[model samples]
Target: KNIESLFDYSAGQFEFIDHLLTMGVGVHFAALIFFLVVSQFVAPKYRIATALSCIVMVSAGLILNSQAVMWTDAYAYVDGSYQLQDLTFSNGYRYVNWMATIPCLLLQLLIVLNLKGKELFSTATWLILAAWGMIITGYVGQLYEVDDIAQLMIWGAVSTAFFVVMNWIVGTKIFKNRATMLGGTDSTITKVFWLMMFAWTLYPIAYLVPAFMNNADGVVLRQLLFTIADISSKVIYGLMITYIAIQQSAAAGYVPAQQALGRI
Candidate 1:
């Protein structure tokens, strides 16, 4: 059953929900423009980070627009309220978008960090695979959120197991690799990593919202959290990486990088 069918939203609530999705799309498009245009401002190598960020924004933008459409199509106006059309409001596309975006985001992080050799491949491989599994499991679990609590919880736990593996690798091996380079010594990189983790934690909260708060307000809140998390994790995260890359290149005596920071 589609969990979105459970909600009986007032017209105002429906508009708010739709607005959140459009806002998400707006943010992604703006980020897409920012990343693509900002790529020229950074050095050649770090451009790949911004490039991948552009890809994430494009994918995110399309998926969010699709979600908004799905939400709108799933309801009908009846007596000044929005009524569910059927079990038709599917957010499955969001998961598919994440499947593409998350790996790209992780790869961008690795590139900006200038991780190399066997360490780069190993960290990226595990992080990529772990994120893939985490999203896949969560996707399957959310299918049951409307009715099958047992299945939802089971798959949620499985998805979380992947999150643990992903986080453990980041907290240890991945972060440690930075210690051997300029990226590790900076507070910006540290803050970026922590912010990513914090944004990610919001996913599980949004995923579990239906379990206890299975109503219109809960749905709105869940989407709200999702939009907030996505903006921070993708757009802001990419922006911070740009700064780090600029600083890193500046330290290497790249005049453009130094000038970008107005330091010379």
Candidate 2:
């Protein structure tokens, strides 16, 4: 079978890249942890809606992944070659991730349209746009026969830019608001945001540590850090999506409340 034949042709790099995919899952799981936390302490007035938005974002991610897991047609291996069934799951995940991004793309558009509020121009919006651009670039490069470095740079820059923007957003808009709006902010949700901050802080370290080590001993260490980098990328990328989701939800209410339901 072609599936078997393809696997037979597979080499070490396939495994290496697949490892990144598995690591990416770990990062997404971490994101799920933090977003769940943030949803909990959302203001009483907005908590239900906020939680709903987060849930939707998560569900879309899961659905996107499901397609990869179930729908992908396998490449068969010719007789006496590596078996198709032995093939690892990396490409599947990366491929499905592209589908998962639709909601986020819409959110990016929303932020630009500022259909909700002027605050859409804030750091969170900028970070989201940048990160997803990286993600898209990375995906296209891999899936559509484009250059790898271009995509990697996009991912690297996206990750770096997001961390920087998040610091400012959390320090100012989120944390400060938690104190004023929620009153005395040390709740589980607040802690979760901090956990996300800790996770977010890992991106650059993950990125640089690998390069810094460079010796043969560094190969394994670098792979490990790269794994962390993958994990951090997915997790933080999800957070960016979640943030946009919440703001988008907030906008959902305004259009109705304003009865801006225009006259035909």
Candidate 3:
């Protein structure tokens, strides 16, 4: 009866979103701490990159908190029932958060991978733009209200197309670029790379759940899947990259600077 009563309260009133936001805040702050600690261990060449990683997670966590607040107000009356509404163009603050964070995520990778010269800047720039494309198209699809699920499906397909191309670069070029002594073929790096790719693929599926299912469970399922994917892609990926940086720094004979030594 309690569960039923909870659902009856309002679609967006689920306290689970509170838990989801809390967990996000926790993971990101933890990630920031991990990155800062590990940055000390990373070689001088990568210390800045390591710091950048921490910066992105800080931004990601802050934006996540902002999105949660927006979510509290991101509902509208639909067919006389309250339904979650997008913050902009039918997508919510999540998309806005992604717009800000995805570029940082890709930049963190480029730095960790040690991409350099024109190749580095060019690739990073394109990846960030492509990420923007993905988020914008996804927002377009999310804008499609219940009466026109077909449009939403179309937009979803376009977004997936961008995601596929982005991953193709990640799997091929980025992976290949790192295939040096820095663990290009190293088992741990390989495993984490694939793990991140697998986690990313879940996004489109999560995004489409509500459009295809159209049931009470659809809302809950979509939220859970998205939350899981966000954590995996951001927090888990950041930690793995931190590990790789530390490993590479050690291989490069990096010693922590005494001046940088302080409490984590």
**Structural similarity to truth (TM-score) of each candidate:** 0.93, 0.42, 0.81
Tens-digit per-residue lDDT, 71-159, candidate 1? 88889898778998753777778888888899898887787777777888998999989999999999999999987988999999999
- After superposing candidate 1, which stretches have Cα over 4 Å from the reference? 183-185
Candidate lDDT (C-alpha), each: 0.82, 0.42, 0.68
Per-residue alpha-carbon lDDT of candidate 2 for residues 135-165, written as tens digits (9 for 90 to 100): 4544443332122334444565554554465
State which candidate has the highest lDDT: 1
Which of the predicted structures, 2 or 3, would earn the higher TM-score when compared with the native?
3
Candidate numbers, best TM-score first, in rank order = 1, 3, 2
Spell out the clash pairs found in candidate 3: 87-92, 179-184
**What overall lDDT, based on C-alpha atoms, would model 3 receive against the true structure?**
0.68
Could you give the candidate ranking by lDDT, starting with the highest? 1, 3, 2
Compared with the true structure, what per-residue lDDT tens digits does model 3 show for residues 159-203? Answer: 888888877776665567666636332556667668778888787
Query: Where does model 2 exceed 4 Å of error?
Result: 1-44, 48-54, 57-61, 64-72, 75-124, 137-155, 187-189, 198-264
What range of 10 consecutive residues in model 1 has the weakest lDDT sum? 177-186
Give residue 189's lDDT in candidate 2 (0 to 100): 34
